[PDB]
Amino acid sequence: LSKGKITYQVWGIRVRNGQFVTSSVLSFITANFNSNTLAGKILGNSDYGPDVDIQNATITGPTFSGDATSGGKSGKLEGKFFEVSIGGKITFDGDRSLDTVFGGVSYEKKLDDTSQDTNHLT
């Protein structure tokens, strides 16, 4: 994970009414391994509830973290990189019903991408 961009296709899980419900037209998260930045959005639905937005997260080695917002609440993102895959968790201290674990697989890899941005690959 030394350079390039990977755009992942991701799904979150929340608990609603004593069951696990998934999120989501696709949810992307993009990791830029040049600039060590990450961004994306988990799209919800009526059961999973509000979308999760991730602007300007950070990458260090095979780990990433940052802030997220969902339903007006701010969350703390932590996750890992492992077709390759990604997973993580987002905690919302102001409303813990928004807490979610997510995972995903690579949608598009550009390992020789030399851009600095976290715009999704298509």
Numbering used by the authors: 194 to 217, 235 to 292, 302 to 341
What did the study's authors say about this model?
The Neisseriaceae family of Gram-negative bacteria express a bipartite receptor, HpuAB, to efficiently use haem extracted from Hb:Hp complexes as an iron source. HpuA is expressed outside the cell, anchored to the outer membrane by its acylated amino terminus. Although a direct interaction between HpuA on meningococci and Hb was not detected using flow cytometry, the lipoprotein is required for the high-affinity interaction between HpuB and Hb, for meningococcal survival on Hb as a sole iron source and for efficient dissociation of Hb2023. To investigate the structure and function of HpuA we crystallized the carboxy-terminal portion of the protein from N. gonorrhoeae (NgHpuA-C) and a full-length homologue from K. denitrificans (KdHpuA).
The NgHpuA-C structure was solved by molecular replacement using KdHpuA residues 168–322 as a search model. The NgHpuA-C structure is almost identical to the C-terminal β-barrel of KdHpuA (root mean squared deviation of 1.28 Å for 120 Cα atoms) with the only variation being the loop between β23 and β24 where NgHpuA-C includes an extra 310 helix. The two homologues, KdHpuA and NgHpuA, share 30% sequence identity and 48% similarity. NgHpuA has a three-residue insertion in loop-4 and a six-residue deletion at the site of loop-5. The Tyr-201 loop is oriented towards Hb but does not make direct contact; notably, this loop-4 is three residues longer in the N. gonorrhoeae homologue and contains three hydrophobic residues (Tyr-226, Tyr-227 and Leu-230), two of which are conserved in N. meningitidis. For example, NgHpuA has a shorter loop-5 than that of KdHpuA, but potentially forms extra interactions from a longer loop-4 containing two tyrosine side chains and one leucine. Indeed, deleting loop-4 of NgHpuA does affect Hb-binding affinity.
